[PDB]
A paper describes a structure:
The Myxococcus xanthus FrzS protein transits from pole-to-pole within the cell, accumulating at the pole that defines the direction of movement in social (S) motility. The crystal structures of the mutants suggested that the observed conformation of Tyr102 in the wild-type FrzS RD is not sufficient for function. These results support the model that FrzS contains a novel ‘pseudo-receiver domain’ whose function requires recognition of the RD output face but not Asp phosphorylation.
The R/R-free values for all data to 1.0 Å resolution were 9.2/12.3%, below the average for structures at comparable resolution in the PDB. This alternate conformation suggests a coordinated mode of motion, but this segment has not been implicated in dynamic rearrangements associated with RD signalling. The position of Tyr102 in FrzS is partially buried, suggesting that apo-FrzS does not prevent interactions along the α4-β5-α5 face by steric clashes with the switch tyrosine.
Residue numbers in the entry: 3 to 124
Write the structure that this text describes.
Amino acid sequence: KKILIVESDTALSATLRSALEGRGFTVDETTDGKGSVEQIRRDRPDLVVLAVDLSAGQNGYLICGKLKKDDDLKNVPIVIIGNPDGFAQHRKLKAHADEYVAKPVDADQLVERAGALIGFPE
């Protein structure tokens, strides 16, 4: 089970990657929001952990929007990590994510949600 973390906070990304790896997921990381949709197309992760507050002012909800509108990528499960002050708005939309986890992230909660969406590695 393969996860891509799209997060420019490298310290957070490394922490979350380690928790997920300890549970048995294979995990990759990218700091590059501009590039992430095409990376997901080439690599096809089983799940994406997607930060809202990406580099250079990028809105990670917009990446989710591109993914939920792409016929080949719209079923990749998406866990948003971000300020919960944005979740109520985003949950209404056609391009809502599959799970929303507040920053500051509880790594164990994130691991649980990943397993809930794609199953735990066995």
